[PDB]
Amino acid sequence: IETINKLNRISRQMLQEMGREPTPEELAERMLMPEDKIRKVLKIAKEPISMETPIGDDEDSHLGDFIEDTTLELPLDSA
């Protein structure tokens, strides 16, 4: 948690002095941490989106209507 916090606070500074975005290398410099750790924290970072979320801008599909199930094998493959 604490580490996440640090991240975003510094993010503002960095964005404002670079002019745009901090690349993982550049961010990792200022943190005094390893680049792959920062990269993997970014990956773990993002939280779940709702399954009922209207993905269709028109309340057309609720995410579930896209959903493929990898567990069920086809009747073809059963044969």
Partner 1 sequence: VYSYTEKKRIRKDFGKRPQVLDVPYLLSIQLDSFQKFIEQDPEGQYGLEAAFRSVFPIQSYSGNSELQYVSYRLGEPVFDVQECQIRGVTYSAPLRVKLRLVIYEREAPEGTVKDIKEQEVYMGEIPLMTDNGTFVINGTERVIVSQLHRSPGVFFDSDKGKTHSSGKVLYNARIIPYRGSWLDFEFDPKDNLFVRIDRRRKLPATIILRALNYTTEQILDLFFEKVIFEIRDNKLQMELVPERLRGETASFDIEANGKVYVEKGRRITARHIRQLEKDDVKLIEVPVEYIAGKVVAKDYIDESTGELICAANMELSLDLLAKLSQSGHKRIETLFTNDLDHGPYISETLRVDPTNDRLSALVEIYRMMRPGEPPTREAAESLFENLFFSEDRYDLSAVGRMKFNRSLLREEIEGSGILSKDDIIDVMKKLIDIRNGKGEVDDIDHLGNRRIRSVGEMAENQFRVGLVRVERAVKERLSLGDLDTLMPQDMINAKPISAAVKEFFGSSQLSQFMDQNNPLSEITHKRRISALGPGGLTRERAGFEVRDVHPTHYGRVCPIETPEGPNIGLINSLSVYAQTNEYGFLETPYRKVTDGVVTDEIHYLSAIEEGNYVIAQANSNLDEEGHFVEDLVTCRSKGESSLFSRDQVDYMDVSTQQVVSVGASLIPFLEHDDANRALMGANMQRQAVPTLRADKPLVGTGMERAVAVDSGVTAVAKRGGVVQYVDASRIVIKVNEDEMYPGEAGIDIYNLTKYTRSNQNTCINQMPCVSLGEPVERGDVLADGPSTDLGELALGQNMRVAFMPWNGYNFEDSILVSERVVQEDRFTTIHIQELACVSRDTKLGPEEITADIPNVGEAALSKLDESGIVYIGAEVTGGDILVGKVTPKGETQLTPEEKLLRAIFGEKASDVKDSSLRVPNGVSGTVIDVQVFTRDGVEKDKRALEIEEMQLKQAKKDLSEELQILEAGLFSRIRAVLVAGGVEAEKLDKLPRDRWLELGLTDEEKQNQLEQLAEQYDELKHEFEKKLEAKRRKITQGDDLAPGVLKIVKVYLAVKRRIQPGDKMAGRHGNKGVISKINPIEDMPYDENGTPVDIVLNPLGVPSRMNIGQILETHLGMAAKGIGDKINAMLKQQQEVAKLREFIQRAYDLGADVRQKVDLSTFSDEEVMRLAENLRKGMPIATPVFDGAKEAEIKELLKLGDLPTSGQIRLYDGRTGEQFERPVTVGYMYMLKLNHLVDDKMHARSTGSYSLVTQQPLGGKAQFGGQRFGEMEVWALEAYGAAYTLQEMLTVKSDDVNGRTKMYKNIVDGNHQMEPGMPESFNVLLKEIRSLGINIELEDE
- In the complex, the residues that contact partner 1 under the rule CB under 8 A are 12-13, 15-16, 19-21, 23-25, 35, 39, 42-43, 45-46, 57, 61, 64-69, 72, 74-76, 78-79
Specify whether the CB–CB gap between 27 and 39 falls below 8 A: no
Specify whether the CB–CB gap between 38 and 24 falls below 8 A: yes
**Whole-number minimum distance, CB 1 to partner 1, in Å?**
18
Residue 1's alpha-carbon distances to 5, 18, 41, in angstroms, are 6, 26, 11
Shorter beta-carbon distance to partner 1: residue 2 or 58: 58
**Whole-number minimum distance, CB 40 to partner 1, in Å?**
8
Give me the amino acid identity at 76: L
